[PDB]
Design a protein around this ligand. Structure first.
Ligand SMILES: [Ca+2]
Ligand SMILES: [Ca+2]
Ligand SMILES: [Cl-]
Ligand SMILES: [Cl-]
Ligand code: NA
Lengths: 381, 380
């Protein structure tokens, strides 16, 4: 079986969904922009040699409906002979896209694929078109969302410190140019309604402090709740993308792999213990890779809530490694959690950090709504 | 890499979307019904050993939103530990579910998966929540009818093929040919009384070429040839398959009913609607090391008679239509519930392969906005 290498990995800026950069830019255009860009940045790839396009997106209606992967590819002027499919495993959708594309390559059904995802939460909000089956109805929000923080004694103060850290790290990455290698300037509109090329994550708040976060009211129970809006993922609009191929094809084309997929895992877990997914998903991915958590040099763990990611970090035995290894350029608290895009976004952030840290192994993992988890171990070379 | 075998393949009846069987049954319930059924029918499979569930569905909002694969699996009381994902390649979605699950097994990331799909077109119609990018392109007569104009497929030829679809589907209904694949499914009869349906309510046995000849063109009034009567029906339904490595099947003492020989997906020109099955099938056959003549049974999704006839012609199969193609009818009679159709035609194909003692079958379909998907199955 062929091994699967990532040859390029890019993303849009994360726009503020509530009135920000991409309020007048459609999901298919954010997507098409990255698809076009992946091709443009890699001249040795002839576009018609793409074998498939896998794209994550959750709220598949309105501008995200009717197979956005294909709509975006047509808008990007990728040859119509290249097929395209849209994948939905909620939060993990574009990491799923990576997995299915990689397996298409491993089996020889493909040699090159585009992978990525998008979520335009400003245009197709999570609350839009909801009709949950009565049979899944399952105070209950706090009960479930804070189960892990109650279990692991993760206080409001620890959550606020982690959230302040997310913005501080994302801002330091912005200021130092550390995100320049992954962000493709993308057109949006500034506060005055004027066309603007964005080359930074609008959604990061450099004014964030632990003091200010400490003023906020609990999102759930007013008396015992610890989660706040300030320690939950931001609401952003964005896309992320990767060019993946067999190691053979990369060699033929004379492209240096940026990373290789070492293992992939996806798991179910109890939906009522929200956010636990990364633990069994990461353990399974590590087992499949022949590695332990200690072998991993850089982790990207999606920050849906500080109240959930901290327990996961604690359970994987990583609490003392947070500042050396985990979400080193911040995470979804600062950058947002545009569902469809997040899997490829954290994989893109991870690979760039691996390069800068000269890391041998990286792990990207995330929780998934209604009790799932997904993880990928990446290896450099 | 492991060979991937299909141990079971089942579907609901196709309910009439306009006020028929499943008007009060949710998409997640049609899906969960089939998941439960696969488990009941294969008792040596322990549900906690499922490695994933891939489910096709296109209109993923309302009751089909928020990853219906998972929601249906939880409703079916499949253990929480089993993951689930919903896939969307329009018309080809549940065939895509098959391919991705197959490859998960081939690479050893899985040993057993559920595959299937659903589309409840009554509850989430194709016209709901549409916002098509202004910069982009089955409507518009020019594109829908291009193949029929290139190949000289007349109104009369289209009406003939459509009447044949209902006739073959009704014959299958009467002969018991669908008994093995249809799981009786709760719906409501015309008076609102609970009823277990075990037949495809949407088929119209009274269809005649004479009646079809009366209909108006769907597109241009003057020169249009396609009609609603020669386009796929609107039905609600689900289909599902239990797929596993040949090794795991042996361990569980479950008999393989077919195995995957090859898989293909291709893009094609979106302005030449319905052509996908041609390059998809040619690619699948090439990868299989087979020719079209090796295939004993073909399932070619009937989006429009005007498009499937040219596809048949370009694959060199015009003389084999009654011998090999859509032998129990197709989407003109049975409907085209997008998410479900890939697994549905695969299910119908595998059961026909058994009834005909075939070695090779090919199932293929066009996909909106210019794609094609195909699978070659083998029965050893
Ligand atoms: Ca480069
Ligand atoms: Ca080391
Ligand atoms: Cl069956
Ligand atoms: Cl077989
Ligand atoms: Na490796």
């Amino acid at each position: 079986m062929e091994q699967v290498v990532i040859v390029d990995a890019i993303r849009t800026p994360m726009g503020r969904s509530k009135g920000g950069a991409f309020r007048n830019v459609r999901a298919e255009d954010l997507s098409a922009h990255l698809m076009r860009s992946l091709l443009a940045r890699n001249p040795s790839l002839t576009a018609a040699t793409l074998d498939d396009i896998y794209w994550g997106c959750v709220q598949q209606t309105l501008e995200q409906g009717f197979n956005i992967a294909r709509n975006a590819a047509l808008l990007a002027e990728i040859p119509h002979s290249v097929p395209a499919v849209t994948v939905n495993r909620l939060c993990g959708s574009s990491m799923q896209a990576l997995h299915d594309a990689a397996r298409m390559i491993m089996t020889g059904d493909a040699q090159v694929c585009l992978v990525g995802g998008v979520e335009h939460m400003g245009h197709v909000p999570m609350s839009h078109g909801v009709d949950f089956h009565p049979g899944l109805s399952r105070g209950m929000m706090g009960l479930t969302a804070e189960m892990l923080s109650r279990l692991h004694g993760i206080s409001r103060e620890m959550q606020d410190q982690f959230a302040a850290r997310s913005h501080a790290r994302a801002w330091a990455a912005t200021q130092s140019g550390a995100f320049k290698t992954e962000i493709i300037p993308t057109g949006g509109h500034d506060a005055d309604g004027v066309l603007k090329q964005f080359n930074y994550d609008e959604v990061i708040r450099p004014e964030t402090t632990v003091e200010a976060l400490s003023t906020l009211r609990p999102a759930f129970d007013p008396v015992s709740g610890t989660v706040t809006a300030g320690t939950s993922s931001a609401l952003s609009d964005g896309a992320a993308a990767m060019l993946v191929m067999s190691e053979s094809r990369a060699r033929e084309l004379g492209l240096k792999p940026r990373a290789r997929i070492r293992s992939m895992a996806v798991v179910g877990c109890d939906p009522s213990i929200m956010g636990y997914g990364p633990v069994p998903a990461s353990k399974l991915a590590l087992k499949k890779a022949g590695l332990s958590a200690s072998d991993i040099d850089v982790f990207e763990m999606n920050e849906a809530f500080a109240a959930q990611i901290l327990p996961c970090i604690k359970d994987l035995g990583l609490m003392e490694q947070i500042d050396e290894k985990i979400n080193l350029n911040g995470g979804a608290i600062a950058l947002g959690h545009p569902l469809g895009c997040s899997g490829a976004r954290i994989s893109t952030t991870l690979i760039n950090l691996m390069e800068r840290k000269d890391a041998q192994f990286g792990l990207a993992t995330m929780c998934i709504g209604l009790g799932q988890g997904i993880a990928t171990v990446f290896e450099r070379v």
